[PDB]
């Protein structure tokens, strides 16, 4: 699925929340 249409209406905080949800919080785990 393309995410562009969703991301276009979101703040940076909301965008990064969604992206980090989809990558399973990769930056914050072993």
């Amino acid at each position, epitope marked *: 699925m393309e995410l*562009d249409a969703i991301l276009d209406n979101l703040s940076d905080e909301e965008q*990064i929340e969604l992206l*980090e949800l989809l990558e399973e919080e*990769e*930056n914050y785990r072993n």
Partner: antibody
Amino acid sequence: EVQLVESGGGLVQPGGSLRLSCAASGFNFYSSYIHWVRQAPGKGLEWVASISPYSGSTSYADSVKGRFTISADTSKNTAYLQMNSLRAEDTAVYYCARYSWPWVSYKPYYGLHFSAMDYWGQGTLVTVSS
Amino acid sequence: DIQMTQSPSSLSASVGDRVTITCRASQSVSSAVAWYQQKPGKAPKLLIYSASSLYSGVPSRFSGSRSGTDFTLTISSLQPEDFATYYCQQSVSYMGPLTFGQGTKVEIKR
């Protein structure tokens, strides 16, 4: 084949204006993002501006906000960079480059997939000098 | 803004060696990182996109990896034609600022 061709560069006096063009061929222009990226002589790459022809959304580097305007003519598959109040520090080779649609996609098997600038123009030199 | 701190600024290595170039993002950029190769007087060419995907037509000696906010470009068997300046670039902000690392100049020994 995918092609991006820049034009409009050259010499301009400080405080002057120039308009660059980027003629695109060989891909779905509505279904793209167009970026301008510049390189001062001997220096690194600096993103300048981006546009989505489909939404019309635009974005600019802080270094050019209020002076530069990016636009597109979908009937012409062309993007433009209007540069006003040019300064010596704007002297650079200016490249047009593209993302193919989408900027980012997601499939449970592969994860997130981000686009990158796979095609670039040859660049056009802008010299700001008296 | 998100900064990309690229290292080293220059390196020199013999043909055949394994070369490593790294970029640390100042905050999360997901995997939205590309690597480009620029030869003198030419536009940059894409090597790696989405942190770890090899772009079509690029030799398999190029690879990209991610560990959190740290990103690495590895050139496994360095060749004379690999003389270039290499750049990382992040694009995590949709229709937002794109930022580049400062570049790495690679010299080939002979």
